[PDB]
Amino acid sequence: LNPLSPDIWMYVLLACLGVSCVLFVIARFSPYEWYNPHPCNPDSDVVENNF
Amino acid sequence: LNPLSPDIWMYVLLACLGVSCVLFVIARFSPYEWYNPHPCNPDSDVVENNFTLLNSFWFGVGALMQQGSELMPKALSTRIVGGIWWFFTLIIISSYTANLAAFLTVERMESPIDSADDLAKQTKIEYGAVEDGATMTFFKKSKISTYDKMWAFMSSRRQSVLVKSNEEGIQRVLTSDYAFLMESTTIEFVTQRNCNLTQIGGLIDSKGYGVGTPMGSPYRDKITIAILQLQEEGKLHMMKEKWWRGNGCPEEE
Amino acid sequence: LIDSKGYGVGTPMGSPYRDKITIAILQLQEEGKLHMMKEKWWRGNGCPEEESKEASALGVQNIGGIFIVLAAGLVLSVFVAVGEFLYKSKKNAQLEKRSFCSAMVEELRMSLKCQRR
Amino acid sequence: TLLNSFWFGVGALMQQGSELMPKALSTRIVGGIWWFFTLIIISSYTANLA
Amino acid sequence: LIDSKGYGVGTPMGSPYRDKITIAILQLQEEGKLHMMKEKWWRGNGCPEEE
Numbered sequence A: 001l002n003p004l005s006p007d008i009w010m011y012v013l014l015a016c017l018g019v020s021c022v023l024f025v026i027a028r029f030s031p032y033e034w035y036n037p038h039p040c041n042p043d044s045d046v047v048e049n050n051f
Numbered sequence B: 001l002n003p004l005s006p007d008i009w010m011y012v013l014l015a016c017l018g019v020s021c022v023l024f025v026i027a028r029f030s031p032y033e034w035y036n037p038h039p040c041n042p043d044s045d046v047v048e049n050n051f052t053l054l055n056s057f058w059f060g061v062g063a064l065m066q067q068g069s070e071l072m073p074k075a076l077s078t079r080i081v082g083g084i085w086w087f088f089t090l091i092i093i094s095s096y097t098a099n100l101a102a103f104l105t106v107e108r109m110e111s112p113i114d115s116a117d118d119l120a121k122q123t124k125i126e127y128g129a130v131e132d133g134a135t136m137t138f139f140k141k142s143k144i145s146t147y148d149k150m151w152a153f154m155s156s157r158r159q160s161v162l163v164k165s166n167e168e169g170i171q172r173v174l175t176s177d178y179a180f181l182m183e184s185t186t187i188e189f190v191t192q193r194n195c196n197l198t199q200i201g202g203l204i205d206s207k208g209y210g211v212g213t214p215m216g217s218p219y220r221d222k223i224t225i226a227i228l229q230l231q232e233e234g235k236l237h238m239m240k241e242k243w244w245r246g247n248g249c250p251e252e253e
Numbered sequence C: 001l002i003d004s005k006g007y008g009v010g011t012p013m014g015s016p017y018r019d020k021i022t023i024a025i026l027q028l029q030e031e032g033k034l035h036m037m038k039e040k041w042w043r044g045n046g047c048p049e050e051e052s053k054e055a056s057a058l059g060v061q062n063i064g065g066i067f068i069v070l071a072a073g074l075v076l077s078v079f080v081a082v083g084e085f086l087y088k089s090k091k092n093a094q095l096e097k098r099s100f101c102s103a104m105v106e107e108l109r110m111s112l113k114c115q116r117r
Numbered sequence D: 001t002l003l004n005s006f007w008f009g010v011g012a013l014m015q016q017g018s019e020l021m022p023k024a025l026s027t028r029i030v031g032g033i034w035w036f037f038t039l040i041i042i043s044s045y046t047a048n049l050a
Numbered sequence E: 001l002i003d004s005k006g007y008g009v010g011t012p013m014g015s016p017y018r019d020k021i022t023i024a025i026l027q028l029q030e031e032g033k034l035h036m037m038k039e040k041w042w043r044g045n046g047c048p049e050e051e
């Protein structure tokens, strides 16, 4: 746990909470991650989100 | 196998079987892992668990070898186990490859003596010369204080370390732990006929041979012109390579 | 060094040899003989041991702690394994009552080992 | 197939994933001892690469 | 080395100073002064560049 200083081990933990949060926020208002499930699916107007 | 200790190679095998039995028990017990892979009829009650005991073993082996498997936890109770086994096998693989760099390139072998002054400090390796030679006579008359330390070791134990010939000086290097002090023209002959001995230092001094004559002899000039004739012609290099031959040893490593 | 003091060649009180050695010790010092004699006798087997080399395969004293943070990760995961059993019965609380009789069903059906439904 | 089996071996050699994974435990031992092989080859390679 | 030869203090043919320097050069050599004077003048900026 020594080859990174103990503020780097915190800054890579606040980056996992920061990137994964903004990956969730963008996946809410990105209108191309509203894909079609059920790989046959005659359209049925139901789309979902992996994130 | 070297960069990890032989108990650590067992503690990884006991953790790869240890986690992969805990991950089976949690996945069988957790209700959120049971999923229905039936896109046609979602209420047809085809709930299923991928984590059988042969699949739970394969997640542990697959994440340990850093190739990764097709199995991903999706219940959170199995997703801490899958997330903490990825950290364990990040530190094991990194500590192995950062210790494997040390166990491949370190040196050939360092000799305990590398010179004459290192041989004077180390009083474990006893050392001597011929007790009738000009090798003894140099260290006895020297005062350079590296060779005052070397003669004080030899003059204390003239019965022990000083020998009678070159042959009895090499046999005590081959058998005992000894550092016999030859002249550089019969170290070159010994280190071709016997490829397990070496020359440690450079040269302590510079000397040279010569056809001795009595005091005021008329031949001391007719020989030294005839030696220079044998040296300009190249005879004294033809006769040296003929006798100090190239019997063959490995290079230096 | 706690203090500093030095080695004096003692003479009786009133010796004329005091100054003749005082000048003489300075004569060996300005020439360099007092450093020659010290580095001949305070020399010897200089301690090799401190340096490094060649070794230290990683043992339990070296790596060590990822066998601890693993076991702390599996103990914490069992604690959230019972926490998803209790909340699944709370999502089964709008069906039977809230509790054990609905909970003992989930206790059984995991133990039948691929009777899936 | 023989094209799909050779892309497992090349895939597991260069440390990348492949779309096919061995089921049927006799093929998981092949796929598990080729993973320990390519771990040691590459860890020995990049150790001397400096 | 292509050959091997050495530096002789020249004297005319029949000089009595020949033997008195022949013994003398051996006297500087057995004591170590010929190695002191060589390692004072053939010393200098030893080439760092190779390392």
Ligand SMILES: CCCCCCCC/C=C\CCCCCCCC(=O)O[C@@H](COC(=O)CCCCCCCCCCCCCCC)COP(=O)([O-])OCC[N+](C)(C)C
Residues within 6 Å of the ligand: A011, A014, A015, A018, A019, A022
């Ligand atoms: C945003 C959405 C949500 C994201 C959430 C998750 C993200 C988490 C993000 C960050 C997490 C926490 C960050 C830790 C700080 C790192 C910096 C650091 O430590 O270096 C130094 C700080 O000194 C500087 O270098 C300051 C320079 C500021 C320039 C602008 C920065 C913004 C870049 C964005 C541009 C945007 C526009 C671009 C448009 C394309 C430390 O100083 P020092 O120790 O003395 O070292 C000497 C430095 N020296 C040699 C330079 C003198």
Ligand SMILES: CCCCCCCC/C=C\CCCCCCCC(=O)O[C@@H](COC(=O)CCCCCCCCCCCCCCC)COP(=O)([O-])OCC[N+](C)(C)C
Residues within 6 Å of the ligand: B011, B014, B015, B018, B019, B022, C060, C061, C064, C067, C068, C070, C071, C072, C073, C074, C075, C076, C078
């Ligand atoms: C239910 C799931 C359980 C896990 C199952 C997983 C299956 C496999 C799991 C593990 C397999 C391997 C076993 C791990 C330890 C091996 C090391 C060993 O035995 O020797 C060491 C003993 O070690 C100690 O004494 C340290 C004490 C920690 C013990 C475990 C604490 C974990 C729980 C606490 C956290 C709870 C927190 C809760 C959450 C926040 C030797 O001692 P040493 O001093 O290291 O040696 C120095 C050498 N020297 C003297 C020469 C210098």
Ligand SMILES: CCCCCCCC/C=C\CCCCCCCC(=O)O[C@@H](COC(=O)CCCCCCCCCCCCCCC)COP(=O)([O-])OCC[N+](C)(C)C
Residues within 6 Å of the ligand: A013, A016, B080, B084, C068, C069, C072, C073, C076
């Ligand atoms: C990457 C994404 C973010 C993850 C978030 C968590 C990261 C932040 C985590 C930790 C932040 C560290 C801050 C320091 C404070 C505690 C340190 C300490 O006191 O050590 C003490 C205990 O420590 C341990 O033994 C291990 C405790 C944590 C292990 C489990 C982590 C849970 C990760 C999975 C769940 C993640 C949670 C989220 C999901 C549910 C030392 O005591 P000892 O070792 O027993 O004794 C010395 C050993 N000896 C006796 C031989 C000498």
Ligand SMILES: CCCCCCCC/C=C\CCCCCCCC(=O)O[C@@H](COC(=O)CCCCCCCCCCCCCCC)COP(=O)([O-])OCC[N+](C)(C)C
Residues within 6 Å of the ligand: B032, B076, C079, C080, C082, C083, C084, C087
């Ligand atoms: C210290 C602890 C000691 C023990 C205490 C007890 C444990 C307490 C902890 C947890 C409580 C246990 C019950 C939780 C309910 C499970 C359902 C669920 O996960 O929601 C959904 C996940 O998708 C989401 O929307 C998740 C929302 C965020 C939660 C996770 C945060 C991640 C950060 C990480 C940091 C750690 C997070 C910490 C917790 C937030 C899935 O729901 P579903 O059933 O699949 O339905 C979907 C419909 N479908 C099936 C067709 C797709």
Ligand SMILES: CCCCCCCC/C=C\CCCCCCCC(=O)O[C@@H](COC(=O)CCCCCCCCCCCCCCC)COP(=O)([O-])OCC[N+](C)(C)C
Residues within 6 Å of the ligand: B001, B005, B006, B009, B010, B012, B013, B061, B064, B092, B093, B096, D028, D029, D032, D033, D036
């Ligand atoms: C970091 C990566 C972690 C990877 C996981 C750790 C796995 C554990 C790996 C090894 C643990 C066991 C060895 C302990 C190490 C001590 C040395 C030793 O005992 O060697 C002994 C020999 O025995 C062997 O060398 C063969 C050991 C098995 C080979 C590894 C199989 C990997 C399986 C893959 C698993 C998945 C496959 C799925 C199912 C197949 C003898 O000592 P020696 O020094 O060799 O001297 C003799 C040699 N000589 C001829 C030169 C004279």
Ligand SMILES: *[C@@H]1O[C@H](CO)[C@@H](O[C@@H]2O[C@H](CO)[C@@H](O)[C@H](O)[C@H]2NC(C)=O)[C@H](O)[C@H]1NC(C)=O
Residues within 6 Å of the ligand: B174, B175, B176, B177
């Ligand atoms: C390999 O090492 C050994 C021991 O370090 C050496 O061989 C022996 O060394 C001891 C000195 O303690 C002698 O008494 C023995 O006579 C030596 N053995 C033989 C057969 O002569 C030596 O350094 C090496 N041995 C080799 C290369 O054979």
Ligand SMILES: O=S1(=O)NCN(C2CC2)c2ccc(F)cc21
Residues within 6 Å of the ligand: B206, B207, B208, B209, E006, E025, E026, E029, E034
């Ligand atoms: O004993 S000598 O006559 N004089 C000393 N030297 C050279 C000073 C090294 C040498 C060098 C090589 C010799 F063959 C002889 C001598």
Ligand SMILES: O=S1(=O)NCN(C2CC2)c2ccc(F)cc21
Residues within 6 Å of the ligand: C004, C005, C006, C007
């Ligand atoms: O005992 S002394 O003669 N006088 C005191 N000192 C100096 C005060 C340090 C020293 C310092 C070095 C000495 F060798 C002797 C002495």
Ligand SMILES: O=S1(=O)NCN(C2CC2)c2ccc(F)cc21
Residues within 6 Å of the ligand: B208, B227, B228, B231, B236, E004, E005, E006, E007
């Ligand atoms: O020219 S010399 O006097 N005679 C020839 N040799 C030896 C044959 C190498 C040497 C070797 C070293 C010298 F210094 C001089 C001479």
Ligand SMILES: C=C(C)[C@H]1CN[C@H](C(=O)O)[C@H]1CC(=O)O
Residues within 6 Å of the ligand: B129, B130, B132, B133, B134, B135, B136, B165, B166, B181, B182, B183
């Ligand atoms: C073989 C012996 C004893 C001779 C050979 N040359 C030196 C000489 O003739 O003076 C000695 C070497 C030595 O003492 O190591």
Ligand SMILES: *[C@@H]1O[C@H](CO)[C@@H](O)[C@H](O)[C@H]1NC(C)=O
Residues within 6 Å of the ligand: B194, B195, B196
């Ligand atoms: C050096 O000694 C070893 C064992 O004492 C033996 O192989 C032989 O005498 C020597 N080695 C070689 C390569 O001649």
